[PDB]
């Protein structure tokens, strides 16, 4: 699975989490198996303005 | 106040929505002990003190 979010909301990407990303965008199951990988993409996904 | 003289507000005779608070960009840290923040909207208390 792949997507972009703000670095502050990365804490929501875990099994059994809550908050608007975990609630309304991307819900992991409580018994998830796998890895969550994230990196800062400010040099790639940000644009002036 | 200066922390040696810390303020207290007693909370009673009222309701609130807590769920927006730990979602809010207004706060740099949120924590709980003996309760889950997720559960607060289901609860009631004899008092709260802020």
Curated annotation (Swiss-Prot), chain A:
Annotated consequence of substituting residue 43 to K: In strain: Omicron/BA.1, Omicron/BA.2, Omicron/BA.2.12.1, Omicron/BA.2.75, Omicron/BA.4, Omicron/BA.5, Omicron/BQ.1.1, Omicron/XBB.1.5, Omicron/EG.5.1
Domain of life, per lineage: Viruses
Region span, Integrin-binding motif: 6-8
Its job: Attaches the virion to the cell membrane by interacting with host receptor, initiating the infection. The major receptor is host ACE2. When S2/S2' has been cleaved, binding to the receptor triggers direct fusion at the cell membrane. When S2/S2' has not been cleaved, binding to the receptor results in internalization of the virus by endocytosis using host TFRC and GRM2 and leading to fusion of the virion membrane with the host endosomal membrane. Alternatively, may use NRP1/NRP2 and integrin as entry receptors.
Quaternary structure and partners: Binds to host ACE2. RBD also interacts with the N-linked glycan on 'Asn-90' of ACE2. Cleavage of S generates a polybasic C-terminal sequence on S1 that binds to host Neuropilin-1 (NRP1) and Neuropilin-2 (NRP2) receptors. Interacts with host integrin alpha-5/beta-1 (ITGA5:ITGB1) and with ACE2 in complex with integrin alpha-5/beta-1 (ITGA5:ITGB1). May interact via cytoplasmic c-terminus with M protein. May interact (via N-terminus) with host bilirubin and biliverdin, thereby preventing antibody binding to the SARS-CoV-2 spike NTD via an allosteric mechanism.
Protein name in UniProt: Spike protein S1
Gene name in the database record: S
Swiss-Prot record, chain B:
Result of changing residue 24 to F: In strain: Omicron/BA.2, Omicron/BA.2.12.1, Omicron/BA.2.75, Omicron/BA.4, Omicron/BA.5, Omicron/BQ.1.1, Omicron/XBB.1.5, Omicron/EG.5.1
Top-level division of the source organism's lineage: Viruses
Effect of residue 29 to A: In strain: Omicron/BA.2, Omicron/BA.2.12.1, Omicron/BA.4, Omicron/BA.5, Omicron/BQ.1.1, Omicron/XBB.1.5, Omicron/EG.5.1
Effect on the protein upon substituting residue 26 to P: In strain: Omicron/BA.1, Omicron/BA.2, Omicron/BA.2.12.1, Omicron/BA.2.75, Omicron/BA.4, Omicron/BA.5, Omicron/BQ.1.1, Omicron/XBB.1.5, Omicron/EG.5.1
Subunit comment: Binds to host ACE2. RBD also interacts with the N-linked glycan on 'Asn-90' of ACE2. Cleavage of S generates a polybasic C-terminal sequence on S1 that binds to host Neuropilin-1 (NRP1) and Neuropilin-2 (NRP2) receptors. Interacts with host integrin alpha-5/beta-1 (ITGA5:ITGB1) and with ACE2 in complex with integrin alpha-5/beta-1 (ITGA5:ITGB1). May interact via cytoplasmic c-terminus with M protein. May interact (via N-terminus) with host bilirubin and biliverdin, thereby preventing antibody binding to the SARS-CoV-2 spike NTD via an allosteric mechanism.
Its biological purpose: Attaches the virion to the cell membrane by interacting with host receptor, initiating the infection. The major receptor is host ACE2. When S2/S2' has been cleaved, binding to the receptor triggers direct fusion at the cell membrane. When S2/S2' has not been cleaved, binding to the receptor results in internalization of the virus by endocytosis using host TFRC and GRM2 and leading to fusion of the virion membrane with the host endosomal membrane. Alternatively, may use NRP1/NRP2 and integrin as entry receptors.
Protein name (Swiss-Prot/TrEMBL): Spike protein S1
Species of origin: Severe acute respiratory syndrome coronavirus 2 (2019-nCoV)
Gene of this entry: S
């Amino acid at each position: 699975d792949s997507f972009v979010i703000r670095g502050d909301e990365v804490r929501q990407i875990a099994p059994g989490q809550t908050g608007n990303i975990a609630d309304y965008n991307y819900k992991l199951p409580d018994d998830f198996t796998g890895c969550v990988i994230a990196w800062n993409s400010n040099n790639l996904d940000s644009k002036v303005g | 106040a200066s922390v040696y003289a810390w303020n207290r507000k007693r909370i009673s005779n009222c309701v609130a929505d807590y769920s927006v608070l730990y979602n809010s960009a207004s706060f740099s840290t949120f924590k709980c002990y003996g309760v889950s923040p997720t559960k607060l909207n289901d609860l009631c208390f004899t008092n709260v003190y802020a």
